[PDB]
């Protein structure tokens, strides 16, 4: 794909009193749409068609002012755009000498400056807006009918607005922002763990920056979405109702401003949701293109860690060493078994006390060697449960990369490294107990040595008798 973003049009500003929302797209305010719907309103009668002439000229002038102000914020917008393109692409950050936190700092500065230019030039635009809609207030105080006029234009415009509301697709945007939000919050968590996991911080800085920008896009999309839904719901709330035929001037003015404000909000809203949809999907493609660079290094950490955790070479040292001690014990033992089997038949009950000494040490010999066998059986049992844990992890590790869906793969690799992090707790106790049994094997090796030496001096004794 592309490492950079084409449209920078999602940045925005509103006034400090929250009275007016601006945008980057045409015509940058919703009340211009309100003045166009007010212009077909003004084409409906004659006393106000003189005003559709007048505010045709006025609203065109305001449109020229807004477009020129947006032009100055274009020549600031490139200065923001370069700082975006530095941060999104890793090797483009690798060309320069400047560090990350300073470039993010100046990015915050130039974002505040861009937002400032739209704010101030649109302040002068807002002074123009207050003059215009003040003269719109003069229009519906100018009408010749005080309470004579009907409500036919209002209900007809309920009908026209209702069909246009039936046109627009709401549910796919709704399910869309639900799915994208769920993937986003999952992404923030898994980057939060993988930040402490991986070594190389360059890619993770670029990813985290795109997470911040994506969050800004999601909040804007929620604002325009909720405002559209509230507008359509309030128009259907007007579409319920009890229908009057005759109206006084002052209340009909409030009805007209209400419904015109509503569809004006709508026709601004679907455009904003359109652009936010497109650029949002682009940023999602960027984050895919970075995590694809990450998971190969992540797999290298997993392969390093599986050898480290499960205590394997030490364990095989214990097992081979213990079986070696068993082999030496059976070796020296059998080598003395022939002489012992001569020595038991030899004395002919000649001596009693030292014979009691002999079969003491003989029972100690046999029970000691059988105890060595049971010890080795225990050690190999704990080891095979430990290996069963490991082969469960490896048997998962074979069927992980067969999926290949370019974003959940990092998640499965994080899941398996999280699974070794789970398994350590019990593996440590298994290895501890194996160490204890090997200490027992050392003590029994000492006992079997001194007992065999005793039996040798004993056969020397009965040879003396």
């Amino acid at each position: 794909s592309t490492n950079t973003t084409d449209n920078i049009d999602y940045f925005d500003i509103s006034d400090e009193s929250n009275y007016y929302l601006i945008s980057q797209l045409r015509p940058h305010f919703s009340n211009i749409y309100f003045f166009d719907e007010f212009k077909r309103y003004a084409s409906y009668h004659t006393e106000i068609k003189r005003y559709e002439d007048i505010h045709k000229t006025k609203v065109n002038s305001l449109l020229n002012e807004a477009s020129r102000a947006i032009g100055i914020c274009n020549r600031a917008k490139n200065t923001v755009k370069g700082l975006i393109n530095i941060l999104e692409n890793p090797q483009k950050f690798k060309t320069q000498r400047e560090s990350y936190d300073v470039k993010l700092r100046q990015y915050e500065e130039k974002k505040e400056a861009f937002r400032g230019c739209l704010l101030n030039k649109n302040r002068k635009n807002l002074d123009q807006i207050k003059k215009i809609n003040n003269e719109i207030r003069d229009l519906l105080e100018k009408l010749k009918c005080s309470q004579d006029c009907q409500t036919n234009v209002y209900f007809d415009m309920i009908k026209i607005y209702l069909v246009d509301f039936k046109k627009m697709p709401y549910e796919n945007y709704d399910t869309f922002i639900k799915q994208y939000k769920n993937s986003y919050l999952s992404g923030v968590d898994m980057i939060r763990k993988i930040e402490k996991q991986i070594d190389n911080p360059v890619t993770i800085n670029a990813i985290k920056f795109t997470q911040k920008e994506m969050g800004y896009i999601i909040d804007r999309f929620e604002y325009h979405l909720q405002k559209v839904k509230h507008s359509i719901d309030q128009v259907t709330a007007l579409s319920d109702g009890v229908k009057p035929k005759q109206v006084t001037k002052n209340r009909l003015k409030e009805y007209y401003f209400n419904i015109g404000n509503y569809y004006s909000i709508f026709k601004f809203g679907k455009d904003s949701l359109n652009m936010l949809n497109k650029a949002l999907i682009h940023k999602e493609k960027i984050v895919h293109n970075l995590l694809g660079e990450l998971f190969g290094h992540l797999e290298e950490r997993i392969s390093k860690l599986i050898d480290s955790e499960y205590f394997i070479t030490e364990s095989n040292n214990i097992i081979s060493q213990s079986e070696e001690t068993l082999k030496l014990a059976e070796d020296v033992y059998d080598k003395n078994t022939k002489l012992i089997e001569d020595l038991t038949l030899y004395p002919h009950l000649e001596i009693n006390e030292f014979k009691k000494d002999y079969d003491n040490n003989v029972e100690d010999l046999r029970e000691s060697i059988i105890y060595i066998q049971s010890y080795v059986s225990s050690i190999k049992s704990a080891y095979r449960y430990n290996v069963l844990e490991k082969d469960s992890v490896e048997s998962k590790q074979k069927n992980i990369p067969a999926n290949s869906n370019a974003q959940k793969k990092v998640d499965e690799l994080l899941s398996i490294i999280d699974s070794i992090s789970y398994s350590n707790f019990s593996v440590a106790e298994n290895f501890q107990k194996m160490k204890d049994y090997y200490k027992e094997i050392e003590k029994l090796k000492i006992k079997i040595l001194q007992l065999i030496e005793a039996i040798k001096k004993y056969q020397q004794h009965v040879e003396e008798l």
């Binding site: 029970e367 049992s381 704990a382 069963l388 106790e429 501890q432 107990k433 204890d436 049994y437």
Partner: protein, 165 residues
């Protein structure tokens, strides 16, 4: 209980309840007396009648809370669940002996209280294949043996700094 990780999760949860904007979030603390392991490993050994040599079974990772610090030798009698019905149908006398039971059907403290009532001297507790099918036979577990609840060194009154302990 009372480790550093518990305080980290504690200040995490209090940080969450502060973040959810509840109407009031407040913290309380007590000072209790629990039973923890020490440096010397607690263990279990077959002792021969000869006493000449010693066989280790295991150094178990588990421990029972509020057990008495002691050491006992003696014969071992299987005592299926230690329930009063399961003690009344028992073939051999239980006095002066150690019982072994399998885990289930009642709390640990009622097993130890019943085997204490029939004048035994020690209780070993395990879990087996029929009730608990687990792949490995090596894992060890934990329980408390206090009949009734609460901090047992302050019965009926709370364990603050106000009560002088």
């Amino acid at each position: 209980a009372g480790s550093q990780k518990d305080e980290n999760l504690a200040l995490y949860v209090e940080n969450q309840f502060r973040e959810f904007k509840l109407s009031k979030v407040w913290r309380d603390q007590h000072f209790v007396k629990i039973q923890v392991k020490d440096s010397a490993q607690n263990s279990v050994i077959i002792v021969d009648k000869n006493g000449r040599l010693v066989y280790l079974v295991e150094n178990p990772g588990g421990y029972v809370a509020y057990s008495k610090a002691a050491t006992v030798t003696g014969k071992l009698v299987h005592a299926n669940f230690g329930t009063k019905k399961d003690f009344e149908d028992l073939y051999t006398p239980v006095n002066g002996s150690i019982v072994i039971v399998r885990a289930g059907k009642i709390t640990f403290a009622e097993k130890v209280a019943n085997a204490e009532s029939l004048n035994a001297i020690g209780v070993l507790i395990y879990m087996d294949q029929t009730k608990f099918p687990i792949v490995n036979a090596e894992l060890s577990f934990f329980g408390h043996a206090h009949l009734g609840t609460g901090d047992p060194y302050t019965p009926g009154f709370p364990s603050f700094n106000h009560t002088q302990f």
